[PDB]
Amino acid sequence: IIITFQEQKNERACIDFAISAPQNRQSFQYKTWTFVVSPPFEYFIMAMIALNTVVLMMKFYDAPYEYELMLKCLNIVFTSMFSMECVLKIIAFGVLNYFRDAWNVFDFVTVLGSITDILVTEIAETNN
Numbered sequence: 001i002i003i004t005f006q007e008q009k010n011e012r013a014c015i016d017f018a019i020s021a022p023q024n025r026q027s028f029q030y031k032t033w034t035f036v037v038s039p040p041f042e043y044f045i046m047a048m049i050a051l052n053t054v055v056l057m058m059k060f061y062d063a064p065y066e067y068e069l070m071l072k073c074l075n076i077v078f079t080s081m082f083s084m085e086c087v088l089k090i091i092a093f094g095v096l097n098y099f100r101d102a103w104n105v106f107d108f109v110t111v112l113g114s115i116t117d118i119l120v121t122e123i124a125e126t127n128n
């Protein structure tokens with residue numbers, strides 16, 4: 001089926017067809033933008049992503065509840081720093097600019113989802 005599969009040049013046509021195809025210096029806007037575009041900041045945030053998945057991997061059954069409290073506090077810290085970086089990118093870019101990346105919208109959804117998870121865990125008993 002692989003050998004005989006009909007289509008119903010190629011590279012050249014694709015190249016020809018695909019050949020068709022920030023922020024200024026005003027205020028604290030520029031300060032935040034200069035901070036958040038620095039590759040150190042992105043390396044830091046991917047390191048925090050790595051540490052957060054490390055925290056997600058450390059759950060296990062019948063934890064001493066001193067370990068569970070540590071995991072909950074670490075989740076608080078990580079979601080707080082993710083919210084901080086999301087707000088920093090908001091105040092560096094524009095709102096319309098931030099919401100037009102297709103990744104920062106995903107990050108925004110996950111940050112608010114984790115925040116809502118944190119708030120619900122306090123009063124999750126009454127939902128049912």
Ligand SMILES: CC(C)CCC[C@@H](C)[C@H]1CC[C@H]2[C@@H]3CC=C4C[C@@H](OC(=O)CCC(=O)O)CC[C@]4(C)[C@H]3CC[C@]12C
Nearest residue numbers: 050051053054055056057058059060061062063064067
């Ligand atoms: C730098 C690279 C290696 C990434 C490392 C990721 C770790 C955060 C992951 C790797 C496998 C996980 C561990 C796999 C084995 C368990 C045993 C579990 O304890 C037990 O089941 C026995 C004790 C008991 O229950 O009575 C506690 C969590 C723990 C250490 C896990 C904690 C998180 C770990 C270390």
